[PDB]
A = this chain, B = another copy of it.
Amino acid sequence: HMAFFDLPLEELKKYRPERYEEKDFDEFWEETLAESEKFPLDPVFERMESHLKTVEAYDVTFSGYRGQRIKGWLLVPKLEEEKLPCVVQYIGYNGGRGFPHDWLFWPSMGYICFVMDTRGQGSGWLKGDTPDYPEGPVDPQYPGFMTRGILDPRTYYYRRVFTDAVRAVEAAASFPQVDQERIVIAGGSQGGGIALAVSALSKKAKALLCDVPFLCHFRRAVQLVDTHAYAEITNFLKTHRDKEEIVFRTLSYFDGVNFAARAKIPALFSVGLMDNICPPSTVFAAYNYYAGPKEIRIYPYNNHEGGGSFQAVEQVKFLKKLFE
């Protein structure tokens, strides 16, 4: 009966709520990253036979969380350029790296594209080839990835994904043709959440493209969203009624809002005001706290599609100006 709505826009634009994060947030990520950096990155780019004619495609492997071997694609447009800018692409929920030809946009716009495959997913809308590896026993969980290892940040699924994602930018920077002054991190929804994390943790990203981000402002999310991936957390709490405080404590280490406050690189965001998967309150919480130079494209009538192909042109224009 009731159509979805959130704070009106004048309120979203001022929405800077009290952040929740433990005092050891930076230390958790420092130690996480240091432990994973002990295993050699060992990036492998295997040229592959392909029907593509305008783009050269590579099969990628590199070491992410605790040396575990993560797949990707590297798509190189055939241009007369000794160096090229690069977009590192992160993938939406239940997706995976698919085929090289699923990622033609950035190469077609003259960018090398590094597509990071997502550990353990790749079965919902686009196939994937990378397994997850638990940090110990695989605890009781609700179906999906949002509650996997949620009783402890050290065991949580996104600790491993975010580490992979940081390592992904280092791997892309190792490709000789990549212009290390123009490496972009990009993503929509889950991709956007991952990218926000990478924007805070990476030593190599120079700009962020963050669309309709997921993994932002969890306590407000579960209040508004009864479908889709945020509802996995609620469903877990319905059964583990004694685990509320622990669950939100775990999630605080992974929250896009806490990452946005640490991020320094320039960013383009987008938000759909009728998006009931990633509510605009959650998106604006992150955007407003984002500490680098930033703009946001606001799509008042769109749901989780956001700006779609209009936003893609905005991203191209944004980056051309940033890097000219």
Contacts and interface: CB of A to CB of B under 8 A. Distances in A.
A276 B143 contact: no
Contact of A147 (B96, B123, B232): B123
A239 B127 contact: yes
A123 B235 contact: yes
Interface stretch (A175-183, A285-293, A299-307): A299-307
Contacts of A101: 105, 108-109, 309, 312-313
A98 to B, nearest CB: 6
Interface residues of A, number: 85
A120 interface: yes
A296 interface: no
Nearest to A127: B239
Contacts of A125: 239
Contacts of A131: 136-140
A128 B140 contact: yes
Contacts of A107: 54, 108
Interface in A245-263: none
A238 B301 contact: yes
Contacts of A102: 309
Contact of A129 (B79, B140, B147, B303): B140
A51 interface: yes
A12 to B, nearest CB: 13
A94 interface: yes
Interface string A138-149: 111111110100
Contacts of A316: 51
A108 B142 contact: no
The number of times this chain is found in the oligomer is 6
A92 interface: no
A120 B108 contact: no
Nearest to A149: B131
Interface stretch (A2-10, A37-45, A186-194, A199-207): A2-10
Contacts of A265: none
Contact of A124 (B133, B225, B235, B300): B235
A77 interface: yes
B140 A3 contact: no
Contact of A140 (B78, B127, B136, B223): B127
A303 to B, nearest CB: 8
12 contacts: A1-B4, A3-B276, A51-B317, A55-B108, A120-B138, A120-B139, A120-B141, A123-B140, A124-B142, A133-B136, A144-B144, A226-B274
Interface of A: 1-5, 51-55, 77-79, 94, 96, 98-99, 101-102, 104-105, 107-110, 120-134, 136-145, 147, 222-227, 232, 234-242, 244, 274, 276, 299-303, 305, 307-310, 312-313, 316-317, 320
Given A3-B276, A133-B137, A238-B303, 14 more contacts: A1-B3, A1-B226, A2-B3, A3-B226, A51-B316, A51-B317, A53-B109, A121-B141, A123-B235, A125-B239, A131-B139, A133-B136, A143-B144, A237-B301
